[PDB]
Short mmCIF file of C-alpha atoms in Angstrom, two decimals:
data_model
loop_
_atom_site.label_atom_id
_atom_site.label_comp_id
_atom_site.label_asym_id
_atom_site.label_seq_id
_atom_site.Cartn_x
_atom_site.Cartn_y
_atom_site.Cartn_z
CA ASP J 1 139.09 154.88 98.04
CA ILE J 2 135.74 154.38 96.22
CA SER J 3 132.98 153.64 98.75
CA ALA J 4 130.00 151.30 98.32
CA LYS J 5 127.67 154.34 98.11
CA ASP J 6 129.92 156.04 95.59
CA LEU J 7 129.89 152.95 93.38
CA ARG J 8 126.12 152.40 93.70
CA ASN J 9 125.53 156.00 92.59
CA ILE J 10 127.93 155.66 89.69
CA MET J 11 126.10 152.55 88.52
CA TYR J 12 122.63 153.99 89.11
CA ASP J 13 123.50 156.97 87.01
CA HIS J 14 123.77 154.65 83.99
CA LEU J 15 120.55 152.72 84.53
CA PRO J 16 117.11 153.66 83.26
CA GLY J 17 114.09 153.65 85.53
CA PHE J 18 114.24 153.18 89.27
CA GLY J 19 113.94 150.26 91.59
CA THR J 20 114.41 147.81 88.69
CA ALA J 21 116.01 144.37 89.06
CA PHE J 22 119.24 145.97 87.91
CA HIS J 23 119.12 148.56 90.68
CA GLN J 24 118.77 145.70 93.14
CA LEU J 25 121.71 143.92 91.49
CA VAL J 26 123.82 147.09 91.94
CA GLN J 27 123.01 146.97 95.64
CA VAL J 28 123.89 143.28 95.87
CA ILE J 29 127.16 143.74 93.94
CA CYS J 30 128.21 146.72 96.02
CA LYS J 31 127.50 144.94 99.36
CA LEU J 32 129.36 141.76 98.45
CA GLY J 33 132.09 143.99 96.93
CA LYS J 34 132.38 146.04 100.16
CA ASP J 35 132.53 142.95 102.31
CA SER J 36 135.28 141.42 100.16
CA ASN J 37 137.28 144.63 99.72
CA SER J 38 136.68 144.34 95.98
CA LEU J 39 134.94 147.65 95.11
CA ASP J 40 137.92 148.80 93.05
CA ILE J 41 137.96 145.84 90.64
CA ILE J 42 134.21 145.90 90.38
CA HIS J 43 134.27 149.58 89.42
CA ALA J 44 137.13 148.92 86.95
CA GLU J 45 135.24 146.06 85.30
CA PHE J 46 132.08 148.17 85.08
CA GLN J 47 133.91 151.04 83.49
CA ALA J 48 135.83 148.81 81.11
CA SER J 49 132.63 147.20 79.90
CA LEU J 50 131.10 150.60 79.25
CA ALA J 51 134.23 151.66 77.42
CA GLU J 52 133.99 148.66 75.10
CA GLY J 53 130.42 149.68 74.24
CA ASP J 54 128.41 147.26 76.37
CA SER J 55 125.16 148.48 77.90
CA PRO J 56 125.30 149.14 81.63
CA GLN J 57 122.98 146.17 82.11
CA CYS J 58 125.37 143.91 80.31
CA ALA J 59 128.28 145.39 82.24
CA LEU J 60 126.55 144.49 85.56
CA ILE J 61 125.89 140.96 84.36
CA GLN J 62 129.48 140.62 83.24
CA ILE J 63 130.66 141.59 86.74
CA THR J 64 128.74 138.62 88.07
CA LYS J 65 130.67 136.33 85.64
CA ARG J 66 134.14 137.97 85.65
CA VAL J 67 134.77 139.11 89.26
CA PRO J 68 135.68 135.93 91.16
CA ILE J 69 133.77 136.74 94.36
CA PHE J 70 130.55 136.14 92.34
CA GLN J 71 131.49 133.03 90.45
CA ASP J 72 129.10 130.27 91.71
CA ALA J 73 127.98 132.48 94.68
CA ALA J 74 124.43 132.20 96.14
CA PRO J 75 122.15 135.21 96.20
CA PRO J 76 121.92 137.07 99.47
CA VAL J 77 118.85 136.49 101.48
CA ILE J 78 117.07 139.77 102.21
CA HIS J 79 114.54 139.63 105.07
CA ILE J 80 111.47 141.81 104.49
CA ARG J 81 107.94 142.14 105.90
CA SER J 82 105.65 142.04 102.88
CA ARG J 83 105.80 141.95 99.10
CA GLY J 84 105.35 145.76 99.25
CA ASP J 85 108.81 146.26 100.64
CA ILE J 86 110.01 145.25 97.15
CA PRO J 87 110.11 148.05 94.60
CA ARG J 88 107.32 148.32 92.00
CA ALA J 89 109.64 147.81 89.02
CA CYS J 90 110.93 144.49 90.42
CA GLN J 91 107.52 142.90 91.04
CA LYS J 92 107.23 141.05 87.72
CA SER J 93 110.77 139.67 88.10
CA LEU J 94 109.90 137.80 91.32
CA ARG J 95 109.85 133.99 91.02
CA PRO J 96 109.68 130.89 93.13
CA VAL J 97 113.18 130.13 94.50
CA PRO J 98 114.78 127.28 92.57
CA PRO J 99 117.17 124.74 93.91
CA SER J 100 120.71 126.12 94.12
CA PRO J 101 120.17 129.63 92.86
CA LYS J 102 123.33 131.51 91.76
CA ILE J 103 123.96 135.22 91.27
CA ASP J 104 125.88 134.41 88.09
CA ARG J 105 122.81 132.67 86.64
CA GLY J 106 120.69 135.79 87.25
CA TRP J 107 119.34 135.25 90.74
CA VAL J 108 120.00 138.68 92.22
CA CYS J 109 118.64 138.05 95.72
CA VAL J 110 116.07 136.02 97.63
CA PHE J 111 113.50 137.96 99.59
CA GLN J 112 112.16 136.26 102.68
CA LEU J 113 108.86 137.59 103.84
CA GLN J 114 107.89 137.62 107.48
CA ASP J 115 105.17 135.00 106.92
CA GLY J 116 107.82 132.59 105.57
CA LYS J 117 107.22 133.12 101.86
CA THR J 118 110.41 133.31 99.77
CA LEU J 119 110.80 134.91 96.35
CA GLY J 120 113.87 135.06 94.07
CA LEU J 121 114.55 138.13 91.98
CA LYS J 122 115.50 136.99 88.48
CA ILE J 123 117.23 138.68 85.56
#
């Protein structure tokens, strides 16, 4: 069966750059997919979007809207030490955390820094 690492690598291979907000979203999708035994449908939806001509970025966003485990789901909280634990390419996508953030509205994750600061990663 497709593993979380297999699927992350498949998705990464389609994305430009490294450590972008989309790379983080792949990680978030693959973790929630692993934990809900849903890696197969996620991979199928990804591939189908590509096959229709959508960009990989759009395909990842569509997963957040079309795979039910994501519909109205909150972003995972990711505990980190400092803002430097967040990849360079994500830094300008970091925002104050709004009320009721949702993955399917573009809130990929919330980083919680050791000093208590919290930042949402937004696409």
